[PDB]
Design a protein around this ligand. Structure first.
Ligand SMILES: Nc1ncnc2c1ncn2[C@@H]1O[C@H](COP(=O)(O)OC(=O)c2cccc(O)c2O)[C@@H](O)[C@H]1O
Length: 536
């Protein structure tokens, strides 16, 4: 057992292995199997290059041997920070076959976060591309080493300079140590706020199960052509169903250079993508673009939007702008993933954030005092299941606060449950605005503002007030010429919005600060409004 990992209770583990949730197969097996069945099928597409399943299988074996020869051992952690390129895949499955643990960093991470990941995880290696999106990662590597002289295996996919060329590692395959389906397979990152994310241990069994359910719930098959538009190392574009779900089903993954329509649209028409995944802010950009671009996105069958709540006023437009089915996805790297079903009524797809994907996912909505709220009532969401961790990596204190004594994980979201078990998310507990003794659901107000013809997007956050404790500020991205602030308040007033929900202040910006995967960082917005106030 990996040191720092919190296992599922023995009796539950058995239940899961008995009902078949935990298949007992490793990622190594998964690839070996798929490679044997349809080796010639194209698994990955990137620009003009392609990789068959057999190809990936072979490179993974040959790379694992190189990694081992390098001195990387079973249980070793390896911080992987690659863009959406083919290497990512040979890198993780090779690590998977050596029993080494990838730690999934994002392209946007810098020395402060990377140095942390390498120290905390006591990383044996750091894997980066030479340069991506205008950033030279070797300079980041140099910054990291100067902070951690002990990190001596810096692997670069591309021009390595003084470091180690990933391409020079492949060698003759070898006998590798046994990897158990119950072993931790990798460490993911949590996505809250306050920098330093917690590390999340996921085992082969519990993760592959999450992939199998996502495949079934999302109808993926040999005909699936999934476009990876978001940084694919994030839990959402990696497994819900993600690039890994697509490989599980024998489909084909297309790698986009960036999330932007300029890059993605041609790819959708050229490669005939049948499904892609976006986060709300990007969904807005795609919808605007889809109305000004002449690309043929007709092959699109399913457009996923998640990571954050995709407001009703926007969601309802998917069918007409893209002519495909919208699928809201509400998941967390900690475990639980919810989806609106592909054959659900338009209203359920447009007004909810789905229902647990597993029959064994347990959900509870509690009130501030850990008491189950009354049916249909709004409250704190706790969850427990086959693919939901029981604790963060080496984090006793935080675990004491994040998990109930019995095993439920407090997701940090405020939600209410529907009759059929669907979840209607209000927003995160931390994003609640308590204006002078009144709670305000930010997203409720943003949805209204999205109805205004001059609003591209809106993010409402709290701001300090010495008299009311908290006031509300909404950041608006103008859909061209920015309307006046009084015009927006009046708009909301005309709609009958309760007076205390109306933004006290309006800030116009060209874009919102975002997180690694692309969601709006309300924390950054709070800092920005808080700073402006201090300026006075
Ligand atoms: N659809 C939706 N609606 C409202 N809030 C949502 C949401 N999706 C995610 N969230 C917020 O994000 C955390 C989970 O954070 P991450 O680990 O960074 O993950 C994801 O955001 C995510 C999105 C879609 C699918 C999957 O698998 C993941 O992991 C939630 O607790 C919530 O606050």
């Amino acid at each position: 057992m990996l040191k720092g990992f919190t296992p599922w209770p023995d009796e539950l583990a058995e239940t899961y292995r008995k009902n078949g949730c935990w298949a007992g197969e490793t990622f190594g097996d998964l690839l070996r199997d798929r490679a044997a069945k349809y080796g010639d099928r194209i698994a990955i597409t990137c620009g003009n290059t392609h990789w068959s399943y057999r190809e990936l299988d072979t490179r993974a074996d040959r790379l694992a041997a190189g990694f081992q020869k390098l001195g990387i051992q079973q249980k070793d952690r390896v911080v992987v920070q690659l863009p959406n390129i083919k290497e990512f895949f040979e890198v993780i499955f090779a690590l998977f076959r050596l029993g080494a643990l990838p730690v999934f960093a994002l392209p946007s991470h810098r020395s402060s976060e990377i140095t942390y990941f390498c120290e905390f995880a006591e990383a044996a290696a750091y894997i980066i591309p030479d340069a991506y999106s205008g950033f030279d990662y070797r300079s980041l590597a140099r910054q990291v080493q100067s902070k951690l002289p002990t990190l001596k295996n810096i692997i670069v996919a591309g021009e390595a300079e003084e470091f180690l060329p990933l391409e020079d590692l492949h060698t003759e395959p070898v006998k590798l140590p046994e990897v158990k389906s119950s072993d931790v397979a990798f460490l993911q990152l949590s996505g809250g706020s306050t920098g330093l994310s917690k590390l999340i241990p996921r085992t082969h069994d519990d993760y592959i199960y999450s992939l199998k359910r996502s495949v079934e719930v999302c109808w993926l098959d040999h005909s699936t052509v999934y476009l990876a538009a978001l940084p694919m190392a994030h839990n959402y574009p990696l497994s819900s169903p993600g690039v890994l779900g697509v490989l599980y089903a024998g489909g084909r993954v297309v790698l986009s250079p960036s999330p932007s329509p300029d890059d993605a649209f041609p790819l959708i028409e050229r490669e005939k993508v049948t499904i892609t995944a976006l986060v709300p802010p990007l969904a807005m950009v795609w919808m605007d673009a889809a109305s000004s671009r002449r690309d043929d996105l007709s092959s699109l069958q399913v457009l996923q939007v998640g990571g954050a709540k995709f407001s009703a006023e926007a969601a309802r437009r998917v069918k007409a702008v893209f002519g495909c089915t919208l699928q809201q996805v509400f998941g967390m790297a900690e475990g639980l993933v919810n989806y609106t079903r592909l054959d659900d009524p338009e209203e359920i797809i447009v007004n909810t954030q789905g229902k647990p994907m597993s029959p064994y996912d347990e959900s509870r909505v509690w009130d501030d005092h850990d008491r189950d709220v009354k049916p249909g009532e709004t409250g704190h969401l706790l969850t427990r299941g086959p693919y939901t961790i029981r604790g963060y990596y080496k984090a006793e204190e935080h675990n004491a606060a994040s998990f109930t004594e019995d095993g439920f994980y407090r997701t940090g979201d405020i939600v209410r449950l529907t009759r059929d078990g669907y979840i209607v998310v209000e927003g995160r507990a931390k994003d609640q605005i308590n204006r002078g003794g009144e709670k305000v659901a930010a997203e409720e107000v943003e949805n209204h503002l999205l109805a205004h013809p001059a609003v591209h997007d809106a993010a409402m956050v709290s701001m300090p007030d010495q008299f009311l404790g908290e006031r509300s500020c909404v950041f608006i991205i103008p859909r061209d010429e920015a309307p006046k602030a009084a015009e927006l308040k009046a708009f909301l007033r005309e709609r009958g919005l309760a007076a205390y929900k109306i933004p006290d202040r309006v800030e116009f910006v060209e874009s919102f600060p975002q997180t690694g995967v692309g969601k709006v960082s309300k924390k950054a917005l709070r800092e920005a409004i808080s700073e402006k106030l201090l300026a006075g």
